[PDB]
Amino acid sequence: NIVGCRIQHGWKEGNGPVTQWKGTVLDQVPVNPSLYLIKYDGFDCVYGLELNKDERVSALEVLPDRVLADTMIGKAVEHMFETEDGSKDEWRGMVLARAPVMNTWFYITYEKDPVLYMYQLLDDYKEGDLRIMPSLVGKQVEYADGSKRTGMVIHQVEAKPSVYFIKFDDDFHIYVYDLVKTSAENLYFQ
Ligand SMILES: COc1c(CN)cc(CN)cc1OCCCN1Cc2ccccc2C1
């Protein structure tokens, strides 16, 4: 496969209401083929779900088929955006890679929220909203006073090889870490 397909499904946590979601399947993770990375319409993060076993997913359907600036990859950037009150704000981050499947899009993450995001950064650049600044994959990871969180390293960023993507068992975001930085100092690997 469903990589490259558009999908829709219901979502239900506990006894809560069922919500309906539409998205695009970007990736079947090689080190965990149960794990799919998904871009949901209108939501900017990249999500990871083990679709074959996550009981929160219901009524999974495949939707009918729909669908250089590589110099930006690896760059530190300031990404400007419009706020709920009209004022402009910005987050600084790093362009990680071109997104798969949705190839005009780019993977990016930010110091203020170091999870995996996906944006049409060449459009934002043309609009004046992007300022360009001048073997662990497959291993288990844990971080832990008393917070004991488990996951897996799922990808290494080719353009900055100390940077990795991690999928934690307790959440559907994709977490991005530079293993030389303070943000990663409580991550341990096996
Ligand atoms: C506002 O999001 C953007 C949108 C809207 N879909 C669109 C675009 C593309 N023009 C950029 C955005 O922001 C680029 C920085 C990263 N965002 C800043 C932020 C603030 C609060 C909550 C989450 C985020 C993520």
From Swiss-Prot:
Changing Y40A: Decreased binding to histone H3 trimethylated at both 'Lys-4' and 'Lys-9' (H3K4me3K9me3). GO terms for cellular component: chromatin; cytosol; nuclear membrane; nucleolus; nucleoplasm; nucleus; spindle. The keyword Cell membrane does not apply. Changing Y117A: Impaired binding to histone H3K4me3 and H3R8me2a. It is found in: Nucleus; Nucleus, Nucleolus. Residues 42-47, 82, 171-173 are annotated as: Histone H3K4me3 and H3R8me2a binding. Phosphorylated during oocyte meiotic maturation. Keywords: Acetylation, Cell cycle, Chromatin regulator, Developmental protein, Isopeptide bond, Meiosis, Nucleus, Phosphoprotein, Repeat, Ubl conjugation, Wnt signaling pathway. Changing Y47R: Impaired binding to histone H3K4me3 and H3R8me2a and impaired ability to activate the Wnt signaling pathway. One of its GO terms (biological process) is meiotic cell cycle. The record marks D113, Q120, D124 as: Histone H3K4me3 and H3R8me2a binding. Residues 2-65 are annotated as: Tudor-like domain 1. One of its GO terms (molecular function) is methylated histone binding. Changing S58A: Impaired phosphorylation. The modification Phosphoserine is found at S58. It comes from the Eukaryota. Residues 72-133 are annotated as: Tudor-like domain 2. The 3 tudor-like domains (also named Spin/Ssty repeats) specifically recognize and bind methylated histones. H3K4me3 and H3R8me2a are recognized by tudor-like domains 2 and 1, respectively. Belongs to the SPIN/STSY family. This is Spindlin-1. The lineage of its organism: Eukaryota, Metazoa, Chordata, Craniata, Vertebrata. The gene is SPIN1.
